[PDB]
């Protein structure tokens, strides 16, 4: 109610060069160059009419997206408000391409065989399964990968929440995937924060967000009655931070895929890294802190750019989750997401 | 001289090759350095007996 | 021989010289000012907000611009120190090893310097984790746990055996001689000719060149170390007590009116932090206005310390009964600024 | 040779009036001090 | 978005007017961001260089120098382009044309030249004001990239010839390269003058190196870390030539020196980093062939 | 401007001497900043708002965290100027170890007597720091300590309009910033003389560029604080050296607040400890606990002297009846106490990082180094081969 | 646009004042991207490993850590530079000043190098504080890889350092006209060495099985050396190639894996990418609203975000 | 406490651990402080 | 770990090899993950360390 | 439990050097031969039990 | 902003006990030992 130091808050309780734009300009006449010398029911429509006026009297901190999924893989209810979910296009082929390259013998024969099972328990009709939760692909690396009670923790949510068919269905095709070069990178590619799901029966319709601020969203405590709004890597161990030695400032964001060809088993590890160096110089540290090349057998280690967090201090030690999983979450995130440099 | 605990500082010629000659043609000198083998071969000043 | 020497020192042989330790401790100390009056003027600005877009936030700033000055002619404002509230470093035993730096060429023979390497490095407290990356930090290993305080770092000076251990019974500088600007004689170069003419006598000692001529001479060892014009251990992210002491370069950049360094002697910025786990070199954006004398009298102050434990036992009450000697044992009694301190 | 700058303010009640339009970029070397501003500048205030 | 303004020439043909009507959601490369540009300085008469239409290669060089813009409105007298290179990252949603396969609801459409594929097909002539339209092709980055190697690793095959690279199924279907003919004889003519820059930074990156490596290790760390990951690796490649083929620091040095920067300069050429995003809502969430396609502004 | 006296015979005449100087003002600035989330944007600009009354008390309680956040900045720029002040008044203040005996000499009257100083001030240094806690116990050597605190200082320029200090009419001079633990020792035990707990403080002056000041400081680049009297007093000057009449003239409004008034010597000063005021909840350091770096120094292995070498009295610290005699051998190692009492020790295996590193062998700095400006053999018998 | 301010110290009275206004548009190699910058994170102070102030092959390895930008403004108590990395992302990109002898054109990705050019060292001295600045130049990518190559060659050629001591150039460039004379120094032991280790770890990886498919076309291309105008400008006169040839081996694993486009991916990736890693790629394009379509040397370049 | 408050509220690992090394001190001084300290009365009053 | 150094005696590893370590003689006695004595009513003062 | 540490108590290895601590640790024998005494540090020495 | 309601209502009914005060340092304080007046008779420790 009214302070003793005013000039700070009629700015902060709160254009003028339009108004003088439009003065000098358009106020200007037939010149330049002139001549010479209903109780609550009925409320509530009109007063939609003044949000639909006010929001075309006027006019970016996101973008925003939709799409139909089924619910056989991901599944966006188990998962909550702040959730990772990756786009896995393109599984129609079984595919073609596994045929190619897979250096002679691999048994490109696998893939087929192994995905096959994954459709038939969980056709093509007209919702493509698309989108698995982030936080599900790590769930499926999770063993092979890692460590203990923290890959598992994300993984016995993914399948409590979605068949431990399904879960186990999946993890041969990402074992068949790893083994004949087809990868689960160039497959699965980040599309957002699950703002909204939206579901029926098999069927979801999930909104999320394709870039911009996580916080800012649907809100509220939750959005709607939910947990909240964040941005969580889901591995505790499985998201990491390699600024060993560190100043204060802007920190980027990577996704890292590491590979072992064959050294131990071809498995793959997703790491939602946290560096303070430009991609650039991402390369370097990368390598000196992956050694998957161990394989004699050549490659890997492809990353990308998800986005820069200028802000550093919320990584909490969350156990809560869907089932509880401890979840690293990083607040401040802007997606600038980048593209593949892996190779 | 003195400045390392291993080395003498001393000043021999600047040219004479070692080994060579027999009184050498003793000319504007400069100071070599050569390793102290052994650590009785430090000074009795600084060792003392 | 470095190599020899190695098998003498670790077997217990005497190697015909001894040492002088150098550390630099840091405590904790409580002042009292007082200021006098209309000390200084002080003037102020105005506000000025700024803002600006962030990762969820709109985030104003408020600043204020100020400036001042010491009203009076004279010295207004002293600031006592009346306790030390704790010593801050574990006032310890840890040693240097020059092995995190690089100044020096190797040894000829790779197989010799890889020896004679990780015999020295092995086990350090300081020896280095992993290989000197080429850019970077020697990287000091962390221990999982610590208890006194920071490990304060010791040097060592190789002195002449026979040098009166009755040198080190007084405050004097470690080096051998006088190096200070405020032992000057006023005439251009006053200092460097006052340390390193060494047909002159010592300031402090007038009777002496020297105490331990391997130290105080300029590119005498002792000098090749330390002395941050050569930077021998530069590389090496640990503090070096002897750096202040031979650095020519920094003595003769101060100057020599005591009407300053006085009042510039109550703030030095600190050559430590008492942030890390080990005393470190001051990491450049941060400073520490430390009191610090030892840079104005240019000299380091006696512990107590015995060569037997038994001389060590008989200085505890004063120096009343304390032995000073026997045979061939020597005991040298605190003389310092905590002297008659509890701590 | 370092010289000061020109004065703002001192201009806003000119004494004066330049009676000549020349291009005066190419005359740069007439002066002690030379700003040539395309419209606006952070300095110019 | 800030549009940019082309100003169609003088009296058009009525048939003319129409197939500009037809080229909203089209990509423009506009030379310079100038507001008020004139139709002649996109036409692709303007990228004539050295006296010559240019290669596919010539094409890509002024793909990577030019800046896109996805053309918003045609109008009578005026084309309004909005560049894709200004303003904020993932804004400015302007509707593209997809052309070929499908588009899903990501992957960064690359602009690629057109005679990848049916070349004259989208020539888009005007003969009215006499000059032409030559639209770049939409594709996903990873089938672009896949695609552009694939047809020059094609082109290998027929510099000196005596399984199918050009099949390539993508998402539901097989995309079919060759429109056999002598479309491949267009289409490989073009590529002519990429395969060699091509083939030429291949064999000149692994034997100029080979000669230096002997004549390096002639004066450490890098003798041993190199020959240690290097086993049964490197020295193959020596090996092959050496039994088909010849063998100088001072050349060596200079030749190092002219092929790191040919071969950087082939880099950028390729990759054809993409120029957009797609994020759809309210759609299909897969642009079906020909159907205008959401879009954003940084890859 | 200095007096002189006059003198006799041997002595060289005295003229006046004048000592005219500037000081150059040093300028800073405090930062402090705040935030709003984008819900509370959407609630403060009206965009969020709704049909519903539950869309009013989430603009309700975003207006009122906005409210919580401006006010706790702007009393951090009263707290940032309590917290700046320390650290200027720190800035210039040498210890006091260093003034007593440097204030003997600045008020005598060179090279001998630059000599004898810096042996004083390294003796009073090591003696007199810490000197609280060090001679604390004695009660008359502490208050004697205060005394030399209080009068090692000299009076700066006279403002009267910092008419506060005074209590109860009569003024204050000095601030005495203490720690709350140190404050508490001192009012307990030795100066209770804490005389007064309120009196009379004032508030802030104010400078502006007005009439000939703004003009000649926007046209001229050049202001001076009140032009428009000093102008004058020159213009006068020629209508028709003793300057008296500097200024008096507002006597401001003044208020009683709560202070800690004690008298040391004569002096009214103000005792203080600001820690719970200002400092207590910011996660800001105190400035007066401070720091000190001390470089010690020991010996390792070094050798008695020639005479330094007896026993100290026949039969002592004596070996059991059949054995050796260690303490008879050069000595190799070192003990000490570790901070907190744990005796310690470092032995010459101990020197193995720094000796044990091939920079015991490079000299080519040394040997080049001291190679400049030729020589002259001396005989060359033994560096002749 | 997450402008950096870095903070100028009290005390620098002009003329450096004087000196540090003409400096906008240069670029803070800041160690970090910070919001506010004091002046001594920034500083060529900060370069300094230990002990030692890396050379001119260390700074790009020092420019390939941290975050660089440009210089918008200098206030009497600040120097406002907006990072290049993070993304100009202003409508216009942020400008940057060209400090160089080259030019920029339009559409040219700009990447930063270390200053290199003998003639004119972009340094102030600035008396009052004890720093000095040292402008890294912008210049467009294929000039300044064509340097990078330049200097990782060059301490090759002293590095020996065997035949007689008289070696190649490599120290002078051609932009247009104009002589580009670079700066020859100092060679560090591991500037040269990572700079070498990485350059002779990518030109492995960029052979495969299907390479050698490749090299069976070197009689080919001398074939083409020789018939076509272009071909035989493609072949440098001092080319290895040349001197190469001065074949397919069976050893088809099935005859299914395509090695042709699985060769070329390969040295795409890891050849084909070596401005990059042996520098600092563009972040940068050249674009000018106005019209005007190059930058003079001095200018002020319109920037936008990567090429 | 005394040990442990003139850390918390006041002013990272050297910190915890110079508070540690004096929380061990203080517990063996001043615990049955009565009974230790008892006969000298300023000592109990402060 | 006896890798490293000890917290109170940094210079160090232990001062006793035959408790400290993991699997020691007085680790197998007194550690209580194996409660050889836990069988017994008495005390092990040990155990609590 | 918190400080994880066991007190010495005031023993000797001797009874002769134990008389030497009665009365406290100013003049007591902290060794003669192989023999050692070692005083009591614990909370509670300065008490009277 | 600044919220002062919190409550005050009845100024409770009072009554003098017997105690025993005690000012330590700038506080007064109650001094106590609650034995014979609680634990005396009963076969309870004090704790």
Redesign the interface.
């Known amino acids: 109610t009214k302070p003793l130091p005013t000039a700070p808050m009629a700015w902060a309780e709160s254009s003028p060069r339009e108004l003088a734009g439009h003065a000098p300009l358009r106020r200007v006449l037939r010149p330049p160059i002139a001549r010479r010398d209903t109780r609550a029911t009925r409320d509530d429509t009109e007063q939609a009419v003044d949000k639909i006026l006010r929001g075309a009297r006027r006019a970016?901190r996101?973008?925003?997206?939709?799409?139909?999924t089924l619910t056989d893989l991901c599944q966006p209810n188990a998962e909550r408000a702040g959730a990772l979910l990756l786009?896995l296009?393109?599984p129609?082929?079984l595919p073609?391409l596994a045929r190619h390259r897979a250096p002679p013998g691999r048994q490109t024969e696998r893939l087929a065989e192994a995905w096959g099972q994954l459709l038939e328990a969980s056709e093509?009709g007209c919702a493509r399964a698309?989108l698995v939760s982030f936080n599900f692909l790590v769930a499926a690396c999770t063993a092979a990968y890692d460590a203990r009670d923290a890959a598992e923790a994300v993984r016995a949510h993914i399948t409590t929440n979605y068949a431990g068919a399904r879960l186990d269905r999946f993890s041969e095709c990402l074992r068949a995937m790893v083994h004949t070069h087809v990868f689960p990178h160039?497959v699965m590619?980040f599309?957002g924060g699950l703002v909204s799901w939206v579901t029926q029966d098999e069927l979801a319709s999930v909104?999320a967000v394709?870039?911009?601020p996580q916080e800012a969203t649907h809100t509220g405590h939750p959005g709607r009655p939910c947990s909240a709004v964040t941005i969580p890597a889901c591995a505790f161990v499985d998201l990491d931070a390699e600024l060993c030695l560190g100043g204060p400032g802007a920190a980027f964001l990577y996704l890292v895929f590491t590979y072992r060809q064959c050294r131990d088993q071809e498995l793959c590890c997703v790491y939602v890294v946290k560096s303070q160096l430009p991609p650039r110089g991402l390369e370097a540290a990368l390598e000196r802190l992956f050694g998957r090349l161990r394989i004699?057998t050549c490659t890997y280690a492809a990353f990308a750019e998800l986005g820069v967090m200028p802000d550093d201090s919320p990584r909490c030690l969350h156990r809560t989750e869907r089932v509880g999983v401890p979840v690293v979450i990083l607040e401040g995130v802007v997606?600038?997401?980048?593209?593949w440099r892996a190779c | 001289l003195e400045l390392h605990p291993a080395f003498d500082f001393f000043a021999g010629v600047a040219d004479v090759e070692l080994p060579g000659g027999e009184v050498p043609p003793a000319g504007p000198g400069a100071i070599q350095a050569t390793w102290r083998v052994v650590n009785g071969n430090l000074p009795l000043a600084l060792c003392p007996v | 021989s470095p190599v020899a020497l190695y098998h003498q020192l670790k077997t217990g042989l005497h190697p015909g010289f001894g040492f002088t330790v150098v550390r630099q401790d840091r405590f904790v100390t409580e002042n009292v000012l007082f200021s006098e009056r209309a000390s200084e003027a002080y003037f102020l600005g105005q506000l000025q907000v700024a803002r600006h877009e962030t990762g969820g936030g709109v985030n104003f700033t408020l600043t204020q611009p100020r400036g001042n000055v010491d009203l009076g002619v004279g010295y207004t404002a002293v600031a006592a120190t009346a306790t030390v509230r704790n010593p801050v470093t574990d006032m310890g035993n840890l040693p240097q090893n020059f092995y995190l730096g690089r100044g020096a060429p190797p040894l000829l023979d790779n197989a010799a310097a890889v020896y004679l390497r990780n015999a020295v490095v092995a086990g350090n407290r300081l020896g280095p984790a992993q290989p000197l990356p080429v850019f970077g930090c020697a990287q000091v290993p962390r221990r999982a746990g610590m208890d006194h305080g920071q490990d304060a770092v010791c040097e060592f000076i190789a002195t002449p055996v026979a040098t009166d251990i009755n040198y080190f019974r007084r405050p004097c500088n470690p080096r051998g001689r006088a190096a200070g600007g405020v032992y000057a004689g006023d005439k251009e170069g006053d200092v460097i000719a006052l340390m390193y003419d060494h047909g002159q006598s010592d300031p402090a000692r007038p009777f002496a060149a020297t105490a331990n001529p391997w130290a105080s001479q300029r590119f005498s060892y002792g000098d090749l170390l330390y002395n941050g014009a050569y930077h021998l251990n530069g590389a090496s992210p640990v503090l070096s007590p002897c750096f202040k002491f031979f650095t020519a370069a920094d003595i003769t950049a101060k100057h020599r009116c005591l009407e300053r360094l006085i009042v510039e002697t109550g703030s030095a910025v600190s050559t430590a932090t008492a942030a890390s786990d080990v005393q470190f070199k001051r990491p450049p954006g941060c400073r520490e206005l430390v009191e610090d004398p030892c840079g104005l009298f240019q000299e380091a102050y006696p512990i107590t310390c015995a060569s037997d434990p038994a001389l060590l036992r008989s200085a505890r009450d004063g120096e009343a009964h304390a032995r000073e000697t026997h045979f061939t044992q020597y005991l040298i009694y605190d003389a310092s600024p905590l002297k008659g301190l509890s701590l | 040779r370092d010289p000061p700058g020109y004065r703002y303010a001192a201009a806003m009640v000119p004494t004066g009036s330049i009676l000549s339009t020349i291009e005066v970029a190419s005359h740069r070397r007439l002066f002690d001090f030379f700003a040539r501003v395309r419209s606006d500048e952070n300095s110019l205030y | 978005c800030?549009e940019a303004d082309i100003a169609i020439p003088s009296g058009i043909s009525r048939p003319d007017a129409a197939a500009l009507q037809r080229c909203e959601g089209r990509v423009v490369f506009l030379?310079?961001?100038?507001?008020q540009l004139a139709l002649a300085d996109v036409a692709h008469e303007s990228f004539v260089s050295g006296g010559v239409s240019p290669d596919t290669l010539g094409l890509l060089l002024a793909y990577?120098?030019?800046?896109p813009a996805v053309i918003t409105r045609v109008l009578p007298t005026r084309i309004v382009a909005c560049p894709v290179?200004?303003?904020?990252?993932?804004?400015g949603?302007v509707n593209l044309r997809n052309t070929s396969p499908v588009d899903?609801?990501?992957?960064?459409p690359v602009s690629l030249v057109p005679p990848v594929f049916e070349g004259q097909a989208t020539d888009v002539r005007l003969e009215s004001l006499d000059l032409t339209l030559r639209f770049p092709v939409p594709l996903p980055?990873?089938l672009a990239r896949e695609i552009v190697?694939?047809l020059?690793?094609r082109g290998?095959?027929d510099?000196?010839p005596d399984?199918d690279?050009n099949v390539l199924?993508?998402?539901?279907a097989r995309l079919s390269l060759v429109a056999d003919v002598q479309q491949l004889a267009s289409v490989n003519t073009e590529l002519r003058?990429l395969v060699?820059?091509?083939?030429?930074?291949?064999?000149?990156?692994?034997?100029?190196?080979l000669?230096?490596i002997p004549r390096?290790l002639?004066?450490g760390?890098?003798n041993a870390?190199?020959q240690m990951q290097?086993?049964?690796?490197?020295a193959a490649?020596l090996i092959?030539?050496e039994a088909?083929?010849?063998?100088?620091?001072?050349?060596?040095?200079?030749?190092?020196?002219?092929?790191?920067?040919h071969?950087?300069?082939?880099?950028?050429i390729?990759?054809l980093?993409?120029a957009v995003?797609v994020?759809?809502?309210?759609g299909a969430?897969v642009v079906q062939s020909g159907d205008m396609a959401p879009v954003?502004r940084?890859? | 401007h200095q007096p002189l006296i006059a003198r006799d015979g041997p002595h060289p005449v005295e003229q006046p001497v004048h000592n005219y100087m500037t000081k150059v003002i040093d300028r800073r600035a405090l930062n402090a900043a705040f935030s709003l989330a984008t819900e509370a944007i959407a609630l403060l600009t009206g965009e969020a708002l709704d049909g519903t009354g539950i869309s009013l008390h989430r603009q309700l309680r975003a207006i009122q965290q906005l409210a919580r956040n401006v006010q706790a900045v702007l009393g951090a720029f009263e707290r940032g100027t309590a917290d700046q002040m320390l650290h200027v008044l720190l800035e210039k203040a040498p210890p006091l170890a260093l003034l007593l005996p440097m204030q003997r000499y600045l008020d005598n009257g060179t090279r001998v007597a630059r000599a004898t100083l810096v042996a004083e001030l390294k003796r009073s240094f090591c003696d007199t720091s810490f000197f609280l806690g060090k001679a604390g116990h004695r009660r008359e050597a502490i208050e004697a300590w205060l005394v030399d605190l209080t009068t090692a200082t000299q009076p700066s320029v006279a403002v009267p309009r910092l008419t506060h200090a005074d209590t109860r009419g009569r003024p204050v001079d000095g601030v005495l910033v203490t720690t709350a633990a140190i404050k508490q020792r001192l009012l307990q035990s030795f100066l209770k003389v804490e005389d007064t707990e309120a009196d009379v403080p004032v508030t802030y002056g104010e400078m502006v560029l007005n009439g000939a000041n703004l003009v000649t400081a926007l046209v001229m680049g050049k202001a001076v604080r009140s032009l428009d009297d000093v102008g004058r007093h020159l213009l006068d000057m020629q209508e028709e050296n003793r300057e008296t009449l500097d200024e008096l003239e507002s006597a401001p409004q003044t208020t009683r607040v709560r202070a800690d008034l004690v008298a040391i010597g004569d002096r009214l000063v103000f005792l203080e400890a600001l820690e719970k005021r200002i400092y207590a909840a910011t996660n800001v350091p105190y400035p007066l606990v401070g720091a000190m770096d001390l470089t010690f120094v020991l010996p390792l292995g070094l050798f008695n002297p020639a005479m330094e070498r007896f026993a100290a009295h026949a039969g002592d610290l004596v070996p059991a009846p059949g054995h050796p005699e260690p303490r008879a051998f050069p000595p190799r190692q070192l003990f000490f106490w570790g901070k907190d009492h744990q005796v310690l020790r470092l032995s010459m295996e101990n020197a193995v990082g720094t000796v044990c590193h091939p920079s015991l062998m490079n000299i080519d700095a040394a040997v080049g180094g001291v190679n400049h400006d030729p020589v002259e053999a001396a005989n060359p018998y033994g560096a002749y081969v």
Do not use: K
């Open positions: 970016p996101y973008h925003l997206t939709r799409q139909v786009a296009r393109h129609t082929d073609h093509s698309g160039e590619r599309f909104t394709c870039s911009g004699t997606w600038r997401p980048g593209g | 800030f030379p310079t961001i100038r507001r990577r120098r030019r800046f290179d200004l303003g904020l990252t993932h804004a949603t899903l609801c990501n992957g960064d980055t990873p190697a694939r020059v690793a290998i095959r510099l000196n399984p690279l199924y993508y998402n539901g003058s060699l820059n091509m083939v030429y930074s291949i064999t000149e990156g692994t034997t100029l190196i000669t230096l390096l002639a004066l760390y890098v870390l190199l290097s086993v049964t690796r490197e490649q092959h030539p088909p083929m010849l063998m100088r620091r001072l050349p060596l040095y200079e030749a190092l020196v002219a092929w790191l920067a071969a950087g300069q082939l880099g950028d390729l990759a980093a993409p995003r994020c759809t809502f309210d969430a954003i940084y890859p």
